[PDB]
């Protein structure tokens with residue numbers, strides 16, 4: 001099944017210096033039951049379809065892997081508080097179109113927030129605080145119909161907050177690289 | 190004992206080739222010693238765990254008398270008939286798992302009264318008619334799967350249904366709405 005290969009590829013591609021994914025085994029190859037592996041929640045108890053991956057604070061490093069496209073039934077991805085780096089892949093919403101919650105906070109992700117984030121049409125929560133993200137916040141984030149939570153604090157973001165995102169509070173944008181506009185202080189004043 | 194009677198009624202309406210209900214002896218004081226039934230400390234039923242049991246037959250409305258029921262696991266059997274409306278009386282229910290069966294008929298509107306419900310998985314059945322709008326009032330709902338049924342009409346996106354995506358609703362008869370491919374007339 002595709003979901004078993006998702007987890008196999010994720011384990012093979014991430015760097016795992018503390019062996020936190022050691023308990024993940026695949027004794028029946030592609031047909032292994034993976035619903036009791038640490039960090040994994042399945043839709044139901046009759047299939048290997050994964051609804052959420054919670055791999056937070058596992059000392060994982062490397063880049064966010066393409067293997068996640070094989071976890072296509074995924075709605076919640078929490079990779080927060082690890083040592084992941086590289087950029088937020090611009091393909092992420094084509095890999096995981098059904099994401100409701102995306103939490104990549106507390107890592108070392110650089111580059112900018114890709115404009116293709118808009119393709120995650122069902123996103124309720126986008127949590128990207130405490131990374132090394134740079135550039136402007138793309139105004140595409142305003143077009144996420146269901147976005148109720150946005151956390152971009154503690155990055156290196158710059159320029160003007162898109163006026164549509166002013167519904168969110170100041171705590172959501174604070175600690176950035178001269179980022180300005182409501183809800184933060186006015187640009188240059 | 191009313192809870193024991195309700196479960197004996199259910200046994201009478203189930204077809205049990207592997208005799209998984211053999212221990213369900215009606216003459217006992219309660220059903221708390223019966224295999225696949227869990228009681229709490231006060232001898233009241235909190236679980237019925239009858240997945241993968243090769244059961245056929247139909248449910249009975251007396252299940253709604255199990256007032257402290259938390260888990261109703263009847264998934265992966267061949268149970269036919271409707272989902273009884275009386276299941277909406279089970280207000281302590283956190284998991285209602287009737288998936289992979291041959292249930293027909295509508296989703297009862299009374300399931301909107303299950304205000305503590307976290308798991309509602311009725312997928313892989315032959316349920317018809319509309320998704321009741323009262324299901325959006327269940328704010329504790331974490332996992333919803335109604336896929337692989339014969340449901341039709343508009344799919345809500347408000348209340349708890351903000352958390353749900355086309356995965357929850359796929360392969361139905363004629364659902365429409367922004368969450369689906371097709372918009373409604």
Ligand SMILES: *[C@@H]1O[C@H](CO)[C@@H](O[C@@H]2O[C@H](CO)[C@@H](O[C@@H]3O[C@H](CO)[C@@H](O)[C@H](O)[C@@H]3O)[C@H](O)[C@H]2NC(C)=O)[C@H](O)[C@H]1NC(C)=O
Nearest residue numbers: 001044045046047048265288289312313314336337338360
């Ligand atoms: C719930 O019902 C759906 C709809 O029937 C089930 O989906 C279907 O599952 C079968 C597997 O028994 C699929 O056939 C397989 O397709 C895959 C490609 O995805 C292929 O690799 C296999 O060789 C095989 O041909 C079928 O395509 C799939 N979808 C449909 C629309 O029929 C689903 O599995 C049911 N859930 C359970 C737990 O049984």
Ligand SMILES: *[C@@H]1O[C@H](CO)[C@@H](O[C@@H]2O[C@H](CO)[C@@H](O[C@@H]3O[C@H](CO)[C@@H](O)[C@H](O)[C@@H]3O)[C@H](O)[C@H]2NC(C)=O)[C@H](O)[C@H]1NC(C)=O
Nearest residue numbers: 298321322323324325326327328343345346347348349350
């Ligand atoms: C999600 O949105 C739907 C539709 O916008 C809401 O359903 C509607 O809820 C209202 C009450 O807020 C219902 O109106 C009431 O009808 C009864 C009976 O006719 C009447 O006694 C009341 O005075 C009131 O008019 C309405 O029927 C219902 N729409 C349906 C069933 O299609 C729903 O409440 C929203 N849920 C959340 C959590 O926001």
Ligand SMILES: *[C@@H]1O[C@H](CO)[C@@H](O)[C@H](O)[C@H]1NC(C)=O
Nearest residue numbers: 025026027028031032033034
């Ligand atoms: C592997 O297959 C065996 C035999 O069917 C089964 O008992 C076991 O639970 C399976 N284990 C996993 C992890 O899938």
Ligand SMILES: *[C@@H]1O[C@H](CO)[C@@H](O)[C@H](O)[C@H]1NC(C)=O
Nearest residue numbers: 250251252253254275277278
């Ligand atoms: C469930 O409650 C309703 C009242 O809301 C009642 O008519 C019905 O008899 C009850 N069902 C059972 C099985 O106790």
